[PDB]
Design a protein around this ligand. Structure first.
Ligand SMILES: C[C@@](Cc1c[nH]c2ccccc12)(NC(=O)Nc1ccc([N+](=O)[O-])cc1)C(=O)NCC1(c2ccccn2)CCCCC1
Length: 392
């Protein structure tokens, strides 16, 4: 009575959720990216699992008589789901860290995971009255169940956790910076102008001491040094001056106060060409230091070769790009936490199923635990789209 009602309710909820998910993907394929395609693959896998797990239970409940392909399809479904979760976590890591023909590559990766799943579900058809009983009559069931646990639960979630460790680390470093580049500034936002004279004067007589200055800053300020290194790398790449300056400032302002103080310093330098006094004041916070101040003054002079109207457009573009990059990072972390919710619900719902299936290899509230575990397995697919609906 209670069990059939709750089972039908959750089955309907999950089927409707996955159908709505895939239908939304079909309708709005015009807005579909790596994450959208991967959650589409997840929805397809979950829906196939539902459609192949309903009939066996229905036949075993409302009948007593009923084998080589259904378990293959079910294992294919679970493999597709979990490996697409892994690929989605990898996408989140590669999109959050590195950007602090692609879509076709994601599509062929989806094809690849489908194919490797249907190839890894081949052994199922080997060993699967009128009751389709795969379990024959010691080591084969346990070994197969452990293999399914490893291939389908353990290493995929392990990869997801590994690639979220370096999504937490990146944000922790970005938080350490800003706080460090705002407490005792003018070591930053001045060396950031001694990292542009190096770009301007390409002679090795500048970079030879610029590398040493970066090493000293790292010995004295880690976040400042990493921001300066990213700034100079971007500036050198985009130089081949204004583009180099924009790239350097953008890379530096990536781990709120820094943009404001830098805009103020640029405005002050716009009318200094007594610039030496301002450079000395900025660098107040050792002949190598004098040479670095000279290079910073060179970069300030280069910036001075810009009209009042021209510099305003430059600072406006720079601050707009800073804001856009911050917003994109926030959106990326929001999608990362949504996928983390997906992984959490998946583990909470599929750990009981996996542990019970590993235990059942021994036996090749028992009924109530079995039915609640199956309802939980379906509830995973129930709450994936519910999580995406509520969180987004
Ligand atoms: C799909 C089926 C049952 C099945 C076997 N026939 C059928 C005919 C019709 C409908 C269903 C079946 N498949 C095997 O159990 N296959 C197997 C059995 C014994 C041995 N052995 O003894 O070595 C080796 C392999 C199975 O419960 N998956 C195990 C899992 C699962 C549970 C619920 C829903 C989906 N997925 C899939 C992920 C790992 C743990 C749970």
């Amino acid at each position: 009575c209670v069990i059939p009602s709750l089972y039908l309710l959750i089955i309907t909820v999950g089927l409707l959720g996955n159908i709505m998910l895939v239908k939304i993907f079909i309708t709005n394929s015009a807005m579909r990216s790596v994450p959208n395609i991967f959650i589409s693959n997840l929805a397809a896998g979950d829906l196939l699992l539902l459609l192949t797990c309903v009939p066996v239970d229905a036949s075993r409940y409302f009948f007593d008589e009923w084998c080589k392909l259904i378990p293959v399809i079910q294992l294919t479904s679970v493999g597709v789901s979990v490996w697409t979760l892994t690929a989605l976590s990898a996408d989140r890591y590669r999109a959050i860290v590195n950007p602090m023909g692609a879509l076709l590559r994601t599509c062929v990766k989806a094809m690849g995971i489908w194919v490797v799943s249907v190839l890894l579900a081949v052994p199922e058809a080997v060993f699967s009255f009128t009751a389709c009983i795969p379990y024959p009559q010691e080591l084969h069931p346990k070994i197969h169940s452990v293999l399914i646990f490893l291939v389908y639960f353990l290493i995929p979630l392990a990869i997801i956790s590994i690639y979220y460790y370096h999504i937490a680390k990146h944000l922790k470093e970005k938080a350490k910076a800003g706080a460090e580049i705002a407490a005792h500034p003018d070591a930053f936002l001045f060396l950031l102008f001694a990292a542009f004279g190096v770009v301007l004067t390409g002679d090795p007589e500048d970079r030879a001491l610029w590398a040493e200055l970066l090493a000293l800053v790292e010995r004295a300020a880690p976040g400042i040094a990493r921001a300066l290194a990213a700034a100079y790398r971007a500036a050198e790449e985009a130089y081949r001056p204004v583009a180099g300056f924009r790239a350097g400032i953008l890379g530096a302002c990536a781990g709120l106060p820094l943009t404001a103080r830098i805009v103020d310093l640029l405005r002050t330098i716009r009318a200094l060409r007594a610039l030496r006094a301002l450079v000395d004041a900025l660098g107040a916070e050792d002949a190598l230091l004098a040479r670095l101040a000279d290079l910073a003054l060179v970069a300030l002079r280069e910036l001075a070769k810009l009209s009042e109207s021209e510099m305003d457009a430059f600072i406006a573009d720079l601050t707009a790009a800073v804001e856009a990059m911050a917003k994109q990072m926030e959106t990326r972390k929001r999608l990362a936490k949504i996928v983390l919710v997906f992984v959490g619900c998946f583990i909470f719902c599929w750990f009981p199923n996996h542990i019970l299936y590993m235990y059942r290899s021994f036996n090749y509230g028992h009924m109530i635990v079995t039915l609640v575990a199956r309802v939980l397995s379906f509830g995973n697919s129930c709450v994936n789209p519910f999580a995406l609906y509520l969180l987004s």
